[PDB]
Design a protein around this nucleic acid. Structure first.
Lengths: 79, 89, 95, 108, 90, 78, 108, 87
DNA sequence: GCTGCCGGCGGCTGGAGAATCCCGGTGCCGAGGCCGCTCAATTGGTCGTAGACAGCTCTAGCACCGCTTAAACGCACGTACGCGCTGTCCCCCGCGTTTAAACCGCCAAGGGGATTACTCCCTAGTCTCCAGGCACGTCTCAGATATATACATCCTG
DNA sequence: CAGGATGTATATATCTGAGACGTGCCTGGAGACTAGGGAGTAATCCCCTTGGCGGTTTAAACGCGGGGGACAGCGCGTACGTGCGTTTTAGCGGTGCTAGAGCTGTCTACGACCAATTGAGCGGCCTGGGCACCGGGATTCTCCAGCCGCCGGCAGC
């Protein structure tokens, strides 16, 4: 019971950054769902990279590597 | 890869043939998949600062690209094939 | 103030800034909880935590302007779930 | 002594030697192991067998004795996971899956 | 009859644009990059069918957007919106 | 040569897409998108052919160009 | 004697020798020519100079001496030709371009 | 050092931060890979064995969109001729 | 009250253009035998990546409480949604017809591709010394606060 | 339809201090200085397949004209998301604290590399016959518009 830790004003602030004028109440869970699908998609590759490296710590290199593998490469983390 | 695929049909569908266009299409398919797997395996072999591609790199590659059921069937047949390879020299 | 004026003020206020929107500890707890399902007894680096954080922010921001385009096409000012799944479907992740 | 192919010892119908040659002059790595070509041949064989069975099912469904790239399109697009694996790949003479949106249909 | 045609073309596979006009258009657009160019035949049909697949995907996306817009007709704004979402025009 | 894409051609293309009704302004927008996609492939196609010092646009070069764009083609070699 | 670096003779501020070593050890090709690392260093210098100049002008326009990733994002996203190159790339602490659809503003 | 000299050659009175330079380093590394792999694939495409200026030139024309590409080719040409003029 | 009366109402009937099947003849062309060559399996040896053991050690999760700031709950309300009536004018849908693609055949030749003698360019081998990474070490001018004024709203008359 | 009071923003004065910018040290890798031998380079010739030409003929696009229904506009019910006040509840953090996982150096060993022989897998080239193609005609398959018995108001009393 932790996914609900993404509070409503946080989603409201994020959407206002997106630039919405009015916000419904049914999107707060669908945004969470897309969030978890994003994260498990990233961390499955992140964990399997470490497993191939046969270590027990996940560094920024593995996560940025997997993010670039999906075609969402991110700068600023020693790529 | 024509003859191997024809033996594949004859070992799956003894009474079904294949057109030439399907032959070229699936030949391009196998070439593309081979190139993808080999590129990922070479990338990983350089990525972990090694210089020899082994079965472990290929295993990580197949576990990495093919999603879901194909992953574990492929790894299972890979291990069984390499085991019968090494047991019978 | 008239309704929506505070919304405009916040829109102009927050699009200029660049800092994160989700508290670090809940996100770290969520990442750790998700990581248990793949392999327990792991260890995480904070760098990876903030990398995941900013990637999540970027994707959600993406999805929100797509939802905004869907909403404006829908002759509406509000945002509805049909818009969010429409944006997800057109891009093709959920195809 | 009498020679025999690597595939016969490996119980495979894919060319171990050809895959090894492709890896060797493939520029991928300086050196390669021995089980890597066998693993690659095995996974290629499994994928080809499954795709050819999926095409054959449809071919016998349409009462034909040979596979047509149209049947390949049906087999690929009718399996959601295989569609995910082959989403961006376009098939020659493949057409499109039949689909009609509900509202476009009449009232009854 | 429109739904009849919808049933009709959705089963076939052959191309739906005349070969010679398409070849003429390809040569006309390719003469600008280089003059005195020779085109191999199979490349022409490859490009034609790739363009057909791209265009039919665009049409299906636009139709999906239009039916999302509680309308039965498709208008250029729907196409521009679909292109914007797919990340091609901008 | 742009007008060679006749109105029934786009009509049957849209019917294959799955549309029910068609207005009167999709036609030129579609032609413009068609032309843009064509040039986006002819550019790297002629680039590939010029790189190889040849004068004939082989199918291999265009399938390579489609793969570079991100849309692979099956049937013409590989 | 009288050792001279390749960068000086090439009129560049880039380690051409380092790029040559990277090409040699990167498993791109069996053999590597001579002018390829020089060309790569030259194009890299050009693109990084343009990027850094745009970032510096953005920082000066924001009345600030140093350069931060926010100015980097403002400079990158404001050039469409640059935007297409960096369309699929996100930058740490870059923010977004401030924009509002014309509809949601009041009547007057 | 090289990025600092590039900054000094265009803006001698403008500094940079720490993370904003790691961004530049990651960008340069990414573009290096994106061009080197492309040039290698062109070299292997024609069954070749050497990488020269022509393959990298074609990769540059392929990758860089338009005006940046034509700017890059001229500077690369002059840069390679000053090398060939005096080794 | 109760007669007609009237328009719909759906229920049914049957004629209407459309889609499907199989027979019957006719081809076009995947599947199979043959030759030999070309590359792949076998021996035999080397020497160098890669695995182990053995250390060092930097570092990430625990806990702990003081503060506080944002999150949750409630609450008038007015604005934005959703639905219904409506007035068209703008696509659909046959018809004559006017037209252009497709087959069909025969050529010339500029371009693609396989061979060949060779040459000269990057790799292979060492020595050397100088550019670049690391450990500091600062003094900055880079930030950060807290202050003071203009401004664009929503009310009033 | 023009002014006033307002919560907002804007500017600006010290603090104020972690870390870009030198400043050295030290080290390992890139340039300087030797062939070689094999990858590319013209030069050649030999196919070949492609742009081009010119009769039929034949299915397809097009402008016209009639028609009917999808859509944008306007009005009204209505209900829920927003601006705002009051808790209160969790995050920041700053302090140590602990052993675990990460890193690197050494010694050894065995497996991929490569060279020389020898044999068969298969790519090619005909070749006979086998499964799709097409035609007409009979067989159904839906789609539509009118006839009709029934029903619920509708002027009268």
């Amino acid at each position: 019971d932790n996914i609900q830790g993404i509070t409503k004003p946080a989603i409201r602030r994020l959407a206002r950054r997106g630039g919405v004028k009015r916000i419904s109440g049914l999107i707060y869970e669908e945004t969470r769902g897309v969030l978890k699908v994003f994260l498990e998609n990233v961390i499955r590759d992140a964990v399997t990279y470490t497993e191939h490296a046969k270590r027990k710590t996940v560094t920024a290199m593995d996560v940025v590597y997997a993010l670039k593998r999906q075609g969402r490469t991110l700068y600023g983390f020693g790529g | 890869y024509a003859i191997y695929v024809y033996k594949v049909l004859k070992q799956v569908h003894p009474d079904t043939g294949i057109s030439s266009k399907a032959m070229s299409i699936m030949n391009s398919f196998v070439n593309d998949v081979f190139e993808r797997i080999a590129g990922e395996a070479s990338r990983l072999a350089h990525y972990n600062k090694r210089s020899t591609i082994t079965s472990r790199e290929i295993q990580t590659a197949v576990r990495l690209l093919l999603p879901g059921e194909l992953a574990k069937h492929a790894v299972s047949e890979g291990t069984k094939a390499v085991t019968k390879y090494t047991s019978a020299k | 103030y008239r309704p929506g004026t505070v919304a405009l003020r916040e829109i102009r206020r927050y699009q200029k800034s660049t800092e994160l929107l989700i508290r670090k500890l809940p996100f770290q707890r969520l990442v750790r909880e998700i990581a248990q399902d793949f392999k327990t007894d792991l260890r995480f680096q904070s760098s990876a935590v903030m990398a995941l954080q900013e990637a999540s922010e970027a994707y959600l921001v993406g999805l929100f302007e797509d939802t905004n385009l869907c909403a404006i096409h829908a002759k509406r000012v509000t945002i509805m779930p049909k818009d969010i799944q429409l944006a997800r479907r057109i891009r093709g992740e959920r195809a | 002594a009498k020679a025999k192919t690597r595939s016969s010892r490996a119980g495979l119908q894919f060319p171990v030697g050809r895959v090894h040659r492709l890896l060797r002059k493939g520029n991928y790595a300086e050196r390669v192991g021995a089980g890597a070509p066998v693993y690659l041949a095995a996974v290629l064989e499994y994928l080809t067998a499954e795709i050819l069975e999926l095409a054959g099912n449809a071919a016998r469904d349409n009462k034909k004795t040979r596979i047509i790239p149209r049947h390949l399109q049906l087999a690929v697009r009718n399996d959601e996971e295989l569609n995910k694996l082959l989403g961006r790949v376009t098939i020659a003479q493949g057409g499109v899956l039949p689909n009609i949106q509900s509202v476009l249909l009449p009232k009854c």
